Amino acid sequence: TQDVTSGYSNLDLDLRDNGVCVVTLNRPDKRNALDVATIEELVTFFSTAHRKGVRAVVLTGAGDHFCAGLDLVEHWKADRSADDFMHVCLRWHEAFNKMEYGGVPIIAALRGAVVGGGLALASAAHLRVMDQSTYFALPEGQRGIFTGGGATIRVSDMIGKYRMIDMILTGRVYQGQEAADLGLAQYITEGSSFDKAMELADKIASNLPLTNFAICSAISHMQNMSGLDAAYAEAFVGGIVNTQPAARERLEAFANKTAARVRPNS
Amino acid sequence: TQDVTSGYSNLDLDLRDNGVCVVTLNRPDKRNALDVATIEELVTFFSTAHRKGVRAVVLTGAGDHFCAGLDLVEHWKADRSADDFMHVCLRWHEAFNKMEYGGVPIIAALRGAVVGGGLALASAAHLRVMDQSTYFALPEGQRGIFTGGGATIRVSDMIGKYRMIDMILTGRVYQGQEAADLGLAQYITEGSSFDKAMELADKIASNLPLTNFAICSAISHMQNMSGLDAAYAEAFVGGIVNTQPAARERLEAFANKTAARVRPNS
Amino acid sequence: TQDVTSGYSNLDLDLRDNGVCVVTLNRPDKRNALDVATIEELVTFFSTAHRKGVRAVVLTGAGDHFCAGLDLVEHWKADRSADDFMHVCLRWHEAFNKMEYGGVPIIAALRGAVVGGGLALASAAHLRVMDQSTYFALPEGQRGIFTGGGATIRVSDMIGKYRMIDMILTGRVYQGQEAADLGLAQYITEGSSFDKAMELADKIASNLPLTNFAICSAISHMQNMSGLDAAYAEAFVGGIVNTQPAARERLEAFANKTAARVRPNS
Amino acid sequence: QDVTSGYSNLDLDLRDNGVCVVTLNRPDKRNALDVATIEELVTFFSTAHRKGVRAVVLTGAGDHFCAGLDLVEHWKADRSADDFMHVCLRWHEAFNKMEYGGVPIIAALRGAVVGGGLALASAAHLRVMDQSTYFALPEGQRGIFTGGGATIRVSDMIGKYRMIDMILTGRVYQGQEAADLGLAQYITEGSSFDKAMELADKIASNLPLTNFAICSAISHMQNMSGLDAAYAEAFVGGIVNTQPAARERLE
Amino acid sequence: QDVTSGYSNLDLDLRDNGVCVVTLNRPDKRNALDVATIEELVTFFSTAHRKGVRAVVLTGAGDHFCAGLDLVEHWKADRSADDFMHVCLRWHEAFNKMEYGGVPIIAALRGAVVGGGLALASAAHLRVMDQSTYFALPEGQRGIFTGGGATIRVSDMIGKYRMIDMILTGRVYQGQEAADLGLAQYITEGSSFDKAMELADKIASNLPLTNFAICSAISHMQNMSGLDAAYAEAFVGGIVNTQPAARERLE
Amino acid sequence: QDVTSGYSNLDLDLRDNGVCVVTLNRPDKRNALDVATIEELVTFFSTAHRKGVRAVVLTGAGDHFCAGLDLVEHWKADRSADDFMHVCLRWHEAFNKMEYGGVPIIAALRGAVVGGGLALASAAHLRVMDQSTYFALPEGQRGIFTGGGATIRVSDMIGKYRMIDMILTGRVYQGQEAADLGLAQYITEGSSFDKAMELADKIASNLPLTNFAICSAISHMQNMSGLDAAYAEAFVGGIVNTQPAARERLE
Ligand SMILES: CS/C=C/C(=O)SCCNC(=O)CCNC(=O)[C@H](O)C(C)(C)COP(=O)(O)OP(=O)(O)OC[C@H]1O[C@@H](n2cnc3c(N)ncnc32)[C@H](O)[C@@H]1OP(=O)(O)O
Ligand SMILES: CS/C=C/C(=O)SCCNC(=O)CCNC(=O)[C@H](O)C(C)(C)COP(=O)(O)OP(=O)(O)OC[C@H]1O[C@@H](n2cnc3c(N)ncnc32)[C@H](O)[C@@H]1OP(=O)(O)O
Ligand SMILES: CS/C=C/C(=O)SCCNC(=O)CCNC(=O)[C@H](O)C(C)(C)COP(=O)(O)OP(=O)(O)OC[C@H]1O[C@@H](n2cnc3c(N)ncnc32)[C@H](O)[C@@H]1OP(=O)(O)O
Ligand SMILES: CS/C=C/C(=O)SCCNC(=O)CCNC(=O)[C@H](O)C(C)(C)COP(=O)(O)OP(=O)(O)OC[C@H]1O[C@@H](n2cnc3c(N)ncnc32)[C@H](O)[C@@H]1OP(=O)(O)O
Ligand SMILES: CS/C=C/C(=O)SCCNC(=O)CCNC(=O)[C@H](O)C(C)(C)COP(=O)(O)OP(=O)(O)OC[C@H]1O[C@@H](n2cnc3c(N)ncnc32)[C@H](O)[C@@H]1OP(=O)(O)O
Ligand SMILES: CS/C=C/C(=O)SCCNC(=O)CCNC(=O)[C@H](O)C(C)(C)COP(=O)(O)OP(=O)(O)OC[C@H]1O[C@@H](n2cnc3c(N)ncnc32)[C@H](O)[C@@H]1OP(=O)(O)O
């Protein structure tokens, strides 16, 4: 009742009765820049969310901008050595890898700037919902530096290796329907991206926990290997998930016609 | 004259004089659901199609719907153990991997529902032709289960890892021009997808057998490795294919101007 | 002052004062077909461009067509053995791999035909700028042969494995906005693709050399491995690039508000 | 007859506990592997698991396990590069079905295990050699690059650089030195066939699924980054270790 | 207390030079690894680097290093396939943090290093065995497929085919033969604990960053094509070899 | 002069059968590898195949093969992390051209084969050691992480965990123990140079293409999943095994 949401500071957490937890970056006056303290909180939260029973996460940023990326001021002031910063990057990965492979569905509800490490963070979620104020960029080059948080991997998977290279090499900005179509977000709304993210999250939370776990962890792992080896692994995932007792009621519903068929959109 | 098309039951096969074989899933009253028997026939057919001389395959489903996926009723009734079903999934892979890496051009002529394992099957073909009635989905989650047939691999290659995840996580349906543009099918027609698939197949069958074999097997293998190692392999594929005696007539046609040049579309 | 641009023949080279070097395929009467001599010049140029101080490359073709691909006449006449041609393909890779992983930003300014090995060459650049006369194809099958220059890898990364297969299997041609949207080029202009490429190149040359080097070499390498291992490598790239002394002035500019913020497009 | 009939170049003997002895049977040609024999290996190893075979003891009739690819057939066929590339894919189909098929294969070696014969031996999970057994890739000296995935499997057995040494120089290994190198896990002073049968009978008394996973998943996981193989392994362990037959054995 | 308190199944002793002795402490159950012990290993190895631990000497209390996965707990829990798949992921979390965590781990082995116990030992960078130490994956005979990534790490240690042999037959290795096979880099006639401490003290006197790279980057690079690992290595070398502390040592 | 001139730190001797002796020639500095020497290795190994070199015997002038990276130059240059990362990429360019270049390289070792010197030796296909030869990665003790892809190649030669042991502890190997470990395929009681020449002359008498494939494809296939390497191998076999020169040899 407070076990999941207590003890944090840079993050604000709200656990709903159906197991959907709203995780809000809460440093709006700094445009939710990710400093080392905030990254450690993300590591802590995503390291235990699955075992804590969280069914889905709606990730958002307080204020008008999702996330401005690496806290550039903390970085500049720290005057870090290469090894000091390499270690900081490894902490980002511990958090973001836990998000991607952890097994808990994450839906990012975007607004305003989703830039640099902020796009890296949005990319670590399974689904992204953008609104009319949302824009994307990897402006790192302007600051004289490289990106991080696995953006070189995830954004390449989202929009194509060559478009990812274009974004960081030129600082090109994308927004609106063009951004959605490019692959920066699966959903675009005329209204509240938060409300749309909550709708998706609630539906996800009503599905089977094991099935969601597999979807949210196995697919990313299988992209990392040869498709011929991935197929063998997929068969074992299917073996466990498809024979689970909890799905028999749904299988029976299909056989007795009480369950809905798959129809084209209206 | 009957060697290629005899001995089957769930599949109907029609071998045309130019070596194009039409393979039709033939359980329309069950919406061509893939039960274990049907999968074994696909294993048998694609395991020997290249050596039998088949030049191209037009894969289609009898009735109004291409394929409804895993036979859910057989699955539910069998009340399978995890290992029993893992083994069933391996049979699906034997068939679908033979389709993808086998070297025989496969063009799927889609109509209606292309869902779950049915999309997995369509994804195992090189080319997909959709019509105005065609719609796509990975509704597995609704049934409480995971997908199979390598859909996590192939559909991710077709539309992007994150869109593949979106489809199975949310049950999102795609159709029409939007589906084509997303990458679910390379061709969309206002008319008969079968006639369009046959047109593509006939043109393919008129090209060189070795060249088609390489195109239909080597490209998928090269995506499975580092691009630096793939390049070395590509050079050996090019070495064998590009120096084949059968292509010299075409090379000569280009040199003497009797062959057509590459021009923009009209 | 002539060290970078002297000693070539099939290539014309022009080094601008800001370190941008214009590399022009110069066999317009042969539509810039890539024969073995031209490939060796590309090997020589891209093998040393980074150490020579070249900041960006604008790659283009003299005449109305970017590049017609493999010199088919030289190939036909040579009546090569499989090993002879496999060796020729390895020379293409030495050049194109040096382009992709070499660390020097390359922007291709396309016009007319970008076909077969010509698309392979355009694909080896980081950015592609197309104009209204530009069209793309992998017509190799028509000539009875396979593609090369890593097109099976790079074009698959650009437009999707299945669209790459479609292009070579059917000889399908793409042009205009449709080509740009498919992923064949990140930029499309109503005017001069060369002028647009120069604008991009000049901006790129004004960024930090180490940062550009990382962007132009590390991202391609990281796509070749599992994302979990790639993340560790990304942290070391970030460690070196993000703590470089040359970027502190830019970081300071952001902290004191003298640097521009990231805003949506107008 | 369902398991043993249908082969001309292979001799099969199915034992009552499910161990099937598969004997290469062209002793007059030292069991050289021609396209027809390769196709029989494709057929046998594609169906053995589903036909109920619990383990296979693979041996060569005569004093020599296998003299390699049939060079007489190769020379007579005068194959083009593409014709031979296709022949190589058939060799891989047979050997891949052996390695990833899930049916434990124990090779009982004797005499020459050379060229494609070493590729065949390497496709088994276990190898038992005797005091007459020797290994080599002699074809390199005559301009041939060994096929059957020997470059893949022998590198895993003895190390990439020792594999390069064998094909580049034709170096021969035998006796205890070969066993210690990694060419065979078992070396006997007596019958390699009898030792292989001892191993096969014990393996056949274990659970079908457990042997299936051991004989297919490990090879697949070795092709992956260890960080992704870990995840796949959890699902393999999840299915194998909670099977009812295993619980009974714990009890 | 910041480093040593917080564990029930592990006994910890932090030495003044930063070497931390981590002792598996359920001697009465031969240090069988139950879910609770695995979670403690996850916690310790997730934080050791940031807590300042310079090297770890891992040992088992009693005469036996580790008897493997706790089969008593497994049998009693009567786990479903998904329940056990989740347990396996926890084992991987602990062992992956050990292998890629960047803190040098030296295992001081004694007696039985079996099943999941061999998986644990393999997760260390270095292993020191004594004259009583033996290695085996006996669980296969009772229908169990070894977890903890043993199929991954033991294949790197002794070769894929020797690893397949161990799990398929339950074959036991000990003494000099085991060391030569690759099961342990060091074998002693005396105390394996004292030899491990000697190794750990020397390692602890080296630079933190250099040890960190050695103990995380090599495993990551082995998961890549050598052509891409080369590029990553250049950046590792770039950071490690230009550190101020290293320059001082050159001088 | 086309093959042998153009180098200052290397001494070259092209024999009539195409074997080229490449001698590291800074004996006064124990052949330490400075940036200039590395660039010469890049040049030689980038062109050897196309210049017609049939095989290379690589040795170090003096009693020691190679003392490693030139630490004097490193200390004086006071390199930044990016400066040194770039130096590392040059080392990889040279060693990658050696490993995948397709020209057989046989290293004749003597004395110290240490640090970057072991990385260089590992870049050859074959290594011949004598009774004075020893191997070590001593730089780790002074805070340096070995470059030149030693973590990649030495892991393939002796196993990832033995490679980690060498860099983490500075452990030295020599004599028969080093050969058995996998540091060298050949050990001689006499001249390692003469034994390397014997090997090189035999290799040079084989077909150019066959040696080219052996010396480039095997390393590339080891970077792939075995299931995809199989397919690539079929095309390598298709081209190599149907060459006219090979047919003649069969006949
Ligand atoms: C693991 S490697 C990762 C590499 C990276 O991620 S590099 C980071 C790339 N990101 C950027 O370049 C985005 C920088 N920020 C902006 O462009 C703007 O602040 C945005 C468009 C996000 C919002 O514009 P606004 O006009 O609404 O706000 P600003 O006036 O620019 O900033 C408001 C406050 O947020 C702070 N802030 C705004 N991004 C800040 C920030 N990334 N850091 C550290 N303080 C920030 C900014 O400094 C200021 O602090 P303060 O009032 O105390 O001086
Ligand atoms: C390797 S892991 C793979 C995982 C999967 O692939 S999971 C499968 C996901 N697929 C689905 O959820 C699609 C289920 N089917 C439907 O939604 C509809 O049947 C569709 C849209 C395909 C067609 O709708 P229709 O209204 O035209 O037909 P239905 O009335 O729903 O079904 C007609 C007959 O086909 C049967 N059928 C229709 N899909 C059937 C089916 N997937 N199985 C087994 N009988 C089926 C359905 O049960 C019924 O049988 P019968 O008249 O004897 O009771
Ligand atoms: C590593 S594996 C790689 C595999 C490949 O890359 S296969 C190559 C696939 N490319 C093609 O099939 C394109 C062939 N060329 C054309 O289709 C046209 O020439 C294009 C559309 C580029 C231009 O059409 P044009 O009507 O403007 O020119 P043409 O009259 O067709 O050709 C003009 C000159 O360029 C020559 N040329 C035009 N492509 C030539 C060419 N690819 N070779 C060798 N001479 C050429 C053509 O032969 C002729 O030479 P010449 O006047 O001395 O006879
Ligand atoms: C996937 S790429 C792989 C490439 C390769 O494997 S190339 C081949 C590699 N193998 C060899 O080079 C082994 C060559 N043969 C031998 O070493 C001997 O035959 C061995 C040691 C196995 C047995 O010696 P024997 O003195 O007991 O018998 P031979 O007199 O040498 O051979 C007896 C018969 O077997 C035949 N044979 C013996 N290897 C034959 C063969 N690889 N082919 C095709 N007929 C053969 C040989 O031709 C002869 O046929 P015939 O009675 O009609 O004259
Ligand atoms: C990631 S998948 C991995 C799969 C596995 O690892 S499966 C297990 C593999 N390991 C084994 O099969 C080793 C089995 N045990 C032994 O071989 C012996 O216990 C050894 C040689 C280690 C020590 O022999 P001892 O004669 O000195 O002691 P035991 O009398 O055999 O065992 C003493 C106590 O430890 C317990 N124990 C001893 N292994 C126990 C155990 N793996 N679990 C759970 N209680 C155990 C054993 O049950 C008993 O508990 P208790 O006093 O309550 O009866
Ligand atoms: C890709 S990252 C790789 C990292 C590394 O490789 S770091 C270096 C690893 N190698 C070593 O630590 C070996 C250090 N040297 C030795 O062990 C000895 O020199 C050996 C055993 C090779 C020969 O001993 P000697 O007693 O016969 O000769 P020395 O008196 O030790 O050295 C003779 C000359 O070679 C020089 N030298 C000897 N290694 C030199 C060197 N690695 N650099 C730069 N000058 C050197 C040494 O400085 C000296 O120069 P000088 O006459 O001007 O004083």
Q: Which residues of A97-119 are buried (b: 16+ CB within 10 A; e: fewer)?
A: bbbbbbbbbbbbbbbbbbbbbbb
Judge if B116 and B192 occupy the same domain: yes
- Cβ distance of E238 and F85 shorter than 8 Å: yes
Tokens of A135: 């824009």
Judge if B245 and B200 occupy the same domain: no
Q: Is the CB of B19 under 6 A from ligand 2?
A: no
What is the C-alpha to C-alpha distance for residues C58 and E236, in angstroms, rounded to an integer?
32
In whole angstroms, what separates CA C254 from the centre of its chain? 32
Q: 């007059």: which residue's tokens?
A: D28
- Cβ distance of A115 and C262 shorter than 8 Å: yes
Q: Are A105 and A126 in contact (CB under 8 A)?
A: yes
Q: How far apart are the first and last CA of chain C?
A: 41
Ligand 6 centre to CA of F67 (Å) is: 5
Task: Give the three-state DSSP class for A252.
Answer: helix
What is the C-alpha to C-alpha distance for residues B49 and B63, in angstroms, rounded to an integer?
25
What is the C-alpha to C-alpha distance for residues A34 and A12, in angstroms, rounded to an integer?
14
Task: Give the three-state DSSP class for D52.
Answer: coil
Rg (CA), chain E: 18
F82: left (phi over 0), alpha (psi -120 to 50) or beta: alpha
Which residue from B224, B228, B232 is facing F225, i.e. has the nearest CB? B224
Where does residue D110 rank: exposed (0-12), middle (13-18), buried (19+ CB within 10 A)?
Answer: buried
- Identify the CA nearest to B209 among candidates D199, C154, D83, A61: D83
How far lies D222's CA from each of D226, D230, E93, in Å?
A: 8, 11, 19
User: What residues does C61 pair with on adjacent strands?
Assistant: C25
Q: Nearest C-alpha to atom 18 of ligand 2 is from which residue?
A: A261
Backbone φ and ψ for B90, nearest 5 degrees, come out as -65, -30
Q: Are C94 and C60 in contact (CB under 8 A)?
A: no
What count of Cα atoms within 13 Å lies in the side-chain half-sphere of residue F68? 20
Interface test with F, best of D91, D137, D145 (most F CBs within 10 A): D145
Q: Is the CB of E56 under 6 A from ligand 5?
A: no
Ligand 4 centre to CA of B51 (Å) is: 29
How far lies F26's CA from each of C24, C205, E212, F34, in Å?
A: 43, 40, 34, 10
Judge if A39 and A122 occupy the same domain: yes
Tokens of F247: 């047919």
Rg (CA), chain D: 18
List, edge to edge, every strand of the sheet that includes C106-109: C11-15, C20-25, C56-61, C106-109, C127-130, C187-188
What is the C-alpha to C-alpha distance for residues C211 and C218, in angstroms, rounded to an integer?
10
Looking at C181, C207, C233, the residue that finishes a domain is C207
In whole angstroms, what separates CA F180 from the centre of its chain? 19
What is the C-alpha to C-alpha distance for residues C177 and A144, in angstroms, rounded to an integer?
33
H runs (alpha helix) in chain A: 36-48, 72-78, 82-101, 117-123, 151-159, 161-170, 176-182, 193-205, 209-223, 227-242, 248-255
Judge if A240 and A137 occupy the same domain: no
Judge if F79 and F137 occupy the same domain: yes
Q: 């521009």: which residue's tokens?
A: C260
What is the C-alpha to C-alpha distance for residues F121 and F11, in angstroms, rounded to an integer?
17
User: For the domain that residue E221 is a member of, what is the CATH number?
Assistant: 1.10.12.10
How far lies D167's CA from each of B207, B244, C237, D157, F114, in Å?
A: 38, 28, 39, 14, 28
Q: Are D77 and D35 in contact (CB under 8 A)?
A: no
Looking at A191, A207, A223, the residue that finishes a domain is A207
- Identify the CA nearest to D65 among candidates D144, D120, D140, D13: D120
Task: Give the three-state DSSP class for A174.
Answer: strand
Which ligand sits closest to the CA of F27? 6
List, edge to edge, every strand of the sheet that includes F55-60: F10-14, F19-24, F55-60, F105-108, F126-129, F186-187
What is the C-alpha to C-alpha distance for residues F159 and F152, in angstroms, rounded to an integer?
10
Judge if E164 and E231 occupy the same domain: no
Interface test with D, best of E82, E151, E177 (most D CBs within 10 A): E151
What is the C-alpha to C-alpha distance for residues A124 and A114, in angstroms, rounded to an integer?
13
Looking at A156, A185, A207, the residue that finishes a domain is A207
Task: Give the three-state DSSP class for A209.
Answer: helix
Judge if F97 and F213 occupy the same domain: no
Which residues are CB-neighbours of F225 under 8 A, at least 6 positions away?
A225, A226, A228, A229, B224, B225, D223, D224
Which residues are CB-neighbours of B140 under 8 A, at least 6 positions away?
A211, B69, B116, B146, B147, B168
Q: Which amino acid is at B221?
A: H
Q: Are E185 and E122 in contact (CB under 8 A)?
A: no
What count of Cα atoms within 13 Å lies in the side-chain half-sphere of residue E27? 9
Chain E residues inside the 8 Å CB shell of C228: 223
Which residue from C101, C226, C240 is facing E238, i.e. has the nearest CB? C240
- Cβ distance of F239 and C82 shorter than 8 Å: yes
In ligand 5, the atom with minimum distance to the C-alpha of E64 is 22
Q: How far E31 CA sits from the closest chain C CA (Å)?
A: 31
H runs (alpha helix) in F48-191: 71-77, 81-100, 116-122, 150-158, 160-169, 175-181
Q: Which amino acid is at A166?
A: D
- Identify the CA nearest to A241 among candidates D106, E56, B85: B85
Q: Which amino acid is at E214?
A: I
Judge if B38 and B151 occupy the same domain: yes
Q: Are D119 and D149 in contact (CB under 8 A)?
A: yes
Total tally of structural domains belonging to chain B: 2
Ligand 6 centre to CA of F68 (Å) is: 7
Chain A residues inside the 8 Å CB shell of C246: 144
Q: What is the 3-state secondary structure (H, E, C) of chain C?
A: CCCCCCCCCCEEEEECCCCEEEEEECCHHHCCCECHHHHHHHHHHHHHCCCCCCCEEEEEECCCCCECCECHHHHHHHCCCHHHHHHHHHHHHHHHHHHHHCCCCEEEECCCEEECHHHHHHHCCCEEEECCCCEEECHHHHHCCCCCCCHHHHHHHHHCHHHHHHHHHHCCCEEHHHHHHHCCCCEECCCCHHHHHHHHHHHHHCCCHHHHHHHHHHHHHHHCCCHHHHHHHHHHHHHHHHCCHHHHHHHHHHHCCCCCCCCCCC
What is the C-alpha to C-alpha distance for residues D27 and D63, in angstroms, rounded to an integer?
8
Chain F residues inside the 8 Å CB shell of A229: 225, 227
Q: Read out DSSP for B38-60?
A: HHHHHHHHHHHTTTTT--EEEEE
User: For the domain that residue E188 is a member of, what is the CATH number?
Assistant: 3.90.226.10
Which residue from D220, D225, D228 is facing A232, i.e. has the nearest CB? D220
Judge if D127 and D149 occupy the same domain: yes
The parent domain of residue A242 ranges over 208-266
Which residues are CB-neighbours of D235 under 8 A, at least 6 positions away?
A233, A236, A237, A239, A240, E85
What is the C-alpha to C-alpha distance for residues E102 and E213, in angstroms, rounded to an integer?
7
Q: Are C111 and C67 in contact (CB under 8 A)?
A: no
Q: 């004289």: which residue's tokens?
A: A144
Which residues are CB-neighbours of D69 under 8 A, at least 6 positions away?
D32, D33, D91, D115, D116, D139, D147, D148
Which residues are CB-neighbours of C172 under 8 A, at least 6 positions away?
C137, C166
What is the C-alpha to C-alpha distance for residues B124 and B102, in angstroms, rounded to an integer?
11
Q: Is the CB of A137 under 6 A from ligand 1?
A: no
Q: Which residues of C8-30 are buried (b: 16+ CB within 10 A; e: fewer)?
A: bebbebebeeebbbbbbbbbeeb
Which residue from E75, E81, E168 is facing D238, i.e. has the nearest CB? E81
What is the C-alpha to C-alpha distance for residues F149 and F95, in angstroms, rounded to an integer?
8
Long-range contacts at E221-224 (CB < 8 A, ≥ 24 apart): E221/C229, E221/F151, E221/F152, E222/D226, E222/E156, E222/F151, E222/F152, E222/F155, E222/F160, E223/C225, E223/C226, E223/C228, E223/C229, E223/D225, E223/D226, E223/D227, E224/B226, E224/C224, E224/C225, E224/C226, E224/C229, E224/D225
What is the C-alpha to C-alpha distance for residues D116 and D60, in angstroms, rounded to an integer?
13
Judge if B264 and B166 occupy the same domain: no
Judge if B113 and B130 occupy the same domain: yes
Which residue from F185, F222, F231 is facing D165, i.e. has the nearest CB? F185
What is the dihedral sign for C-alpha A166, A172, A178, A179? Answer: positive
Judge if E149 and E215 occupy the same domain: no
- Identify the CA nearest to F126 among candidates C127, D159, C107: D159
Ligand 3 centre to CA of C113 (Å) is: 9
Q: Is the CB of C72 under 6 A from ligand 3?
A: yes
Q: Are D31 and D64 in contact (CB under 8 A)?
A: yes
Q: Read out DSSP for chain B?
A: --TTTSS-SSEEEEE-TTSEEEEEE--GGGTT-B-HHHHHHHHHHHHHTTTTT--EEEEEESSS-SB--B-HHHHHHHT--HHHHHHHHHHHHHHHHHHHHSS--EEEE--SEEETHHHHHHHTSSEEEE-TT-EEE-GGGGGT----TTHHHHHHHHH-HHHHHHHHHH---EEHHHHHHHTS-SEE-SS-HHHHHHHHHHHHHTS-HHHHHHHHHHHHHHHTS-HHHHHHHHHHHHHHHHT-GGGHHHHHHHHTT-SPPP----
What is the C-alpha to C-alpha distance for residues A259 and A252, in angstroms, rounded to an integer?
9
Q: Any idea what DSSP says for residue D33?
A: B
A to C CB pairs, distance under 8 Å: 175
- Cβ distance of B229 and E224 shorter than 8 Å: no
Q: In Å, what resolution does this model reach? A: 1.8
Q: Is the CB of B34 under 6 A from ligand 2?
A: no
Quickly count: other Cβ atoms within 10 Å of residue B261's Cβ: 12
Chains that touch E (3 or more CB pairs under 8 A): A, B, C, D, F
Rg (CA), chain C: 19
